[PDB]
Design a protein around this nucleic acid. Sequence first.
RNA 1: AAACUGCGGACGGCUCAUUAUAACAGUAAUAGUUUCUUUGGUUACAAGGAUAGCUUUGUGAAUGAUAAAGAUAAUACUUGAGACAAUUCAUUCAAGUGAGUUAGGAUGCCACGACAAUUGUAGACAAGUAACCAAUGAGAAUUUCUGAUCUAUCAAUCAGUUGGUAGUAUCGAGGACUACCAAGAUUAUAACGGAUAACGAGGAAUUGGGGUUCGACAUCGGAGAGGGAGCUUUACAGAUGGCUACCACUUCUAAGGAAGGCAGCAGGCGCGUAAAUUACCCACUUUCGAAUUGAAGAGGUAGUGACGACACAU
RNA 2: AUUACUUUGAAUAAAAUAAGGUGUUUAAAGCAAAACAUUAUGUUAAUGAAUAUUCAAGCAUGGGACAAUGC
Lengths: 141, 143, 129, 56, 246, 106
Amino acid sequence: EQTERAYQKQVFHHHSVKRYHKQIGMGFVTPAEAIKGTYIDKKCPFTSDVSIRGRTLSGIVKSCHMKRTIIVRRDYFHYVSKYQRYEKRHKNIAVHCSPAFRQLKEGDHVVIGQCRPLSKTVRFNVLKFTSRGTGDKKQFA
Amino acid sequence: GGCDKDGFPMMTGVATNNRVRLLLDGRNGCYKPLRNGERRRKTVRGAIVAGDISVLNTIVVKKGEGEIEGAGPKRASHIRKLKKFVIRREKRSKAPKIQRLVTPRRLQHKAQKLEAKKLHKIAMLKEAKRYAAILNRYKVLKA
Amino acid sequence: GITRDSRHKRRATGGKKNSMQKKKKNTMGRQPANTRLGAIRVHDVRCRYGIIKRRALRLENGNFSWASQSITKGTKILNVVYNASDNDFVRTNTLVKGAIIEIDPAPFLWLACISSRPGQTGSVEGYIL
Amino acid sequence: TRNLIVNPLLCRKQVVVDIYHQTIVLNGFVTKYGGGKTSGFALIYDTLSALKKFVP
Amino acid sequence: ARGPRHHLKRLNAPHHWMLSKLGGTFAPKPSHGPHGMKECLPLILILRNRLNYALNGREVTMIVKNRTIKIDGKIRTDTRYPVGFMDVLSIPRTKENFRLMYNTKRRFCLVPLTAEQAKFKLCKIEKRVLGTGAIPYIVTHDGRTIRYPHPELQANDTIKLNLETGKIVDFVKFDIGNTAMMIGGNGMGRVGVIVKREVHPGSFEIVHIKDAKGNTFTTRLNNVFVIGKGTETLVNLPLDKGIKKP
Amino acid sequence: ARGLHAARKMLAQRRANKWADKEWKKGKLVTRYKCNPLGTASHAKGLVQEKLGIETKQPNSGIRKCVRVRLLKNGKKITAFVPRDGSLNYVNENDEVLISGFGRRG
RNA sequence: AAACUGCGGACGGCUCAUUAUAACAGUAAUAGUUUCUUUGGUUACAAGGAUAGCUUUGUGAAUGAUAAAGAUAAUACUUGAGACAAUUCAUUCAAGUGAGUUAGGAUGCCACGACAAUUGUAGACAAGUAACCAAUGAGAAUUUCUGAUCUAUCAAUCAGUUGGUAGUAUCGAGGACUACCAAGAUUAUAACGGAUAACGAGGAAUUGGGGUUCGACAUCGGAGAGGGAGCUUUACAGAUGGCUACCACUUCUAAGGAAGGCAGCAGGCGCGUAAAUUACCCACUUUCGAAUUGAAGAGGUAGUGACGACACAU
RNA sequence: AUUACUUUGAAUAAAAUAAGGUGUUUAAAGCAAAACAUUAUGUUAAUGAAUAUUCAAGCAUGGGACAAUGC
C-alpha cells in the first residue's frame, strides 16, 4: 500500500483515518473490493475525485501489461456507400483500471466511461467487467 | 547633457561617450515608440560628454545658456503656499480653475459626492438588513 | 519561450508529427523559480487575463499548522531534509510541495511537510507530521 | 397614398405617393416602362428644424 | 482569430431575423447582456423592419439615444441592445407597449399589450444556488440574479416579475398540469400542456407536450417554458394562439 | 467476394485494377509535367530554328512542311506543322510561334 | 485647436506556402479552464509630490529625430477613511445533480483589502469608479466518438517513447516538463515511410439509377505576413500597415548615418497560353471611438470587361 | 446480455438544391408588395415557404425475423 517515496494518501482523507468511497452515477454499483480494500488510488472512479462524464463505451480487454491501466479494443463495422457493404474495423483505447477489479484479465468484456484526461492517452476509466474464457495465459491487471 | 557632432543625445544610462547604436526608446528618451512595444534600436551618444560634442547643455552644468561649440498655482493646497489669494493674470481676466482649498465649488461637491453618496449607502443597508430579516420565514415553516 | 502543446511530441504509434503552425501564447510555459532557503523575496508575475501570481524566489518562514492541537503558528524553517522526487532538492534546500523540512518548535511554548505551492501562491505553508 | 405611417419620434409621416399619370422629402422614385405611372415615397418633416437636423 | 469578434456577416446572422441576402455585407451584431446571440433580436431590427419607424441606421441611432425606448421598466440607449423573449418593450411617445413572444413560424412576434399588463413580465428560473454566507438566490432566463427568494422557487419554475417594484408576484411550479410555451427547435413557438416527462439519467430530459387540439409533440427539457397553471395563460398569446396548422 | 462484410476486398480490387487503364493512368502519374513538352498548358510560345519537310506516310506522296521550335519554359525542341497551304512563306526565324497540339489528345 | 489621460488599431481586408488522423464536419465533455465589452446584484468643507502641451536656449541632412532649464493640472501616479469580500493551508458539519468531503456553514493564523479624496448647471436626478458573485458563453480554448486521396519498387515502427508516483509549469487537464520505478505502445482491419500541380467543410459540373471529377476563391473553421527564432503592451498577439537579432532583399544620404516590409486598395517589373482604374464618396450594411456630429481603398458609386446568365433589333 | 437491422422522433448556420407565393412589361432575377380599403383606418399584429433534406457517426424509442459476440 505504501511502497513509494512519498506517503500515499487518499484525495479525501479524514479521521473518525477513514476509508472514503463515493459512488459514480447512472447505476454502476461500486465493487466490494473498493469498500473494504486498503489500496490507494487517486484515479479510481469510486475512491477519488474523478467524475464520469458523457461518453460511455465498451470493448474487449486485450493488454494488461501496464500499471493500473489496460488497453480496450473496440470492434465495429464501417459502411461504404458505393458498394453497399460493411467492413471490419477496430480502435484501441487506453483506459485506467483501478485495483478494485483484482480478477480482471485479458479477454474480458469491460464497460468504460469518460473522465478528465489522466495521461497522454488515457481518458476513459473502467466501470465494470464481465469475465470470459481462458487462453492458456491468465494475465491479470 | 548635450547633443553630439551629429546632434545626438548622450544616452545617460549608457555611461559611454560615443554614438551608441542601441535599443533606442522612451526608456532612453532618445526615441518615441512609434507603435505598441516599439523599441527602435538606434545609435545615440555616450553619456560622458567629450571630444566631438557639440552642444553641451548640462554636465554638472546649469543655465549657462548652453555653450555649444564644445504661470501659477491652480490647485489649492498649493495655491495656498503662496480665492482672494490666487495669482491671476491679464478685458477678459482669466484666472485658472482653483482646486483643493475646500475647492470653493464645495457646494456642488457637497450636494453631490459624500452626502449624495452616503445617503444611498445608508439607505441600501436597511433593505440589506430588512430583506435578510424577512428570510426568517425561509426555514421556520418550510422545515 | 517554453511551450506546453502536444504538437512537438510523437503519436501513440511512435510516428513523428508534422508541424502546421508556429508557436502560440496559449500554450506558453515559464521558467521554474526554485524557492531556495534565504531572505524574503517574491516577484509578481503578470499571468494571463491580468491575474497576478506571487513567485516566491527565496523564503525563510512559513505558517505551519498542527492537526492534533488545532493550532497554526508561524515558524522559521531550518533545513530541507527530504524530497520525495529529487534528492538534489535536498542539497540546494529548494522548497516545493511535499518537501519534508525540519523546523524548530519554538512557538510549539504553547518534522514538517510542506502543503502549499511557493512558486505559485508565493509563500510556504505546511503541517506537522 | 398607398400606405401611410405616422412617425412621432422622427416627427414625420411615411407615405408611398403614387403618381397616376422645404419641409418635404422627395426620393425613391421609379417609373414603369415607357413612362406613365410613377411611384415613390413622400416624407414630410413639418418643422423646418426637422429638415435642419433630421437629414443624413 | 486572436480574440472576440465584432462584425457579423449577413449570411451568418440567425435565420429568424429574415435579413435580405442582398441587403448588405454585414448584419448588426447584438451586444452582450441578458440574452444570447441567437436568442435575441437586436433593437435596430425591431424598429427598422418590424415597425418600419426608421428606414436606415442613421434614423435608428437618432431614436434609441434619444431616450425613447423603455426595455422592461428601465430605459435602454444602446442601438444593438439584445431584445429577446417576452421582456416588454414600450414607447411612451407613441403610447404603445409591445412584447416579444415566439410564434409557430420560429419568429419573434410583437404582441400588443395594454398599459396595465405591460407593468409585469414573466421570467423562467434557470438555476438556484446557495451564496456565501448562506444567501440563496435564483437566476432567471434573463440573466437576473434576484435577491432573497421564496424557498420553493426551484430550478425550472416560472416567476412573475414587476417592472416598477421588482418583487415576485406569483410563481408557477413545473408539473404535469401546466401550460408551456416553446422556445426550442421544431416545436418552437407552440403552446401546449405538459403531460409526461420521461427521464434519462445520461444526457437529457424529454418532455411530451400535448397541444390543445390533441397533437402530441416531444422536446428537450431545456426548451420548455411554463406559461401558466391549469390550462391558463398569464399573458396574451400571439395572433395564432400558439396553434400549429399541419 | 460478394459477401455483405466484404467491402475491403471489393475496394482494393478496384484500386489496383484501375492502374491498367491506359487513359486514366496517364492523367494521374507524374509525367505530364516532365515528359509532355506542353505540360498542362493549352498552347505554348517558342522560337523557330529550322524549317523541315516531312515526307508523308506510305499511301501518300508529298512533303508536309514543318518547323523545329524550341519553347521558352521547358527549352525542349518540338517539330511543329504549318497549318495551311503555302504558310511556310510567312514563317521566319527567331520569332514567336504559338503551338497548340493537334486534333488528337497529344 | 494642441497636449496629457481613456478607448482602439488582437475586428475588418488579403492569400493558400505549411499541413495525410494533423486540420475540418457532425457529436459529446469541461464535476478540467475562462477574461474584455455589456447586463442583474452585493460589498475628511478633501491630503501629497512631477509631468506634457506652455516659455527659453539647441543640435543633426534627415525619420512620425532628439538635449537642458523655468513652471502648471487629473478620473495620469500615491497616502489616507467613511467599517466586508475574495486567495492558500490544516481540521470539521453538511442539501441540488445521473454522480462530488460538492454550492454552503464552523474553527486558526497567513497574504490582498474597496465602493475615485471623481464630473456636469445643465442635460435632487444623472454620470463615474474598486473588487466579488451570476449572465453575455450555445462564445473562446483544450478534449471524447466517427469519417480522408494514391503508394508494399514503403513491413516492421517508437525510447519521453507506453504506464506509475512525487514535484514543476500553465488560465487550466496532461510526459507539457523534471527526478525515481516498470517495459511497455502501434502493425496485414496496412503501423512507419513516400507523393500531391492537398488548406477542410457548406457546395459546383455532369448524371435513369449507381456514380465520376472538382472546391484558392461569397459563408464557416485553420494557417501566414520575405525565412526562422525571441519578446513588449494589454482582457485577448508569440501581433509583424508592433519591436530585437541573424539570413535575403529595397530605399534616402551632406558618406557621418537613417527606415522598410503591397499574401491591404489602385499601380509597376517579371512569369506565363492566361486575367481590370495609380477614379469618387462614408449617402446603403456595419464597425471603431471620449460618442446621435469624426474615420473606414470595409461598403457604395463610377470606368474596363464576347468569362458566363436573361429578354430582345435588322 | 449486448451489438447489428428496421420505424418514429429529439437536436440540427445561412447561402446553395428541390420548392410555396409573388405579373421585375415576361425571364434570369429579388423577397419583395398588393387583390383592397379605389387607399391615411386594417385587409394587417400582412407575407418570410412546415422551407423537406443532410451522408458517416452520436441520443431515445416501437419490433425480433434475418445475423454477430459467451453462458
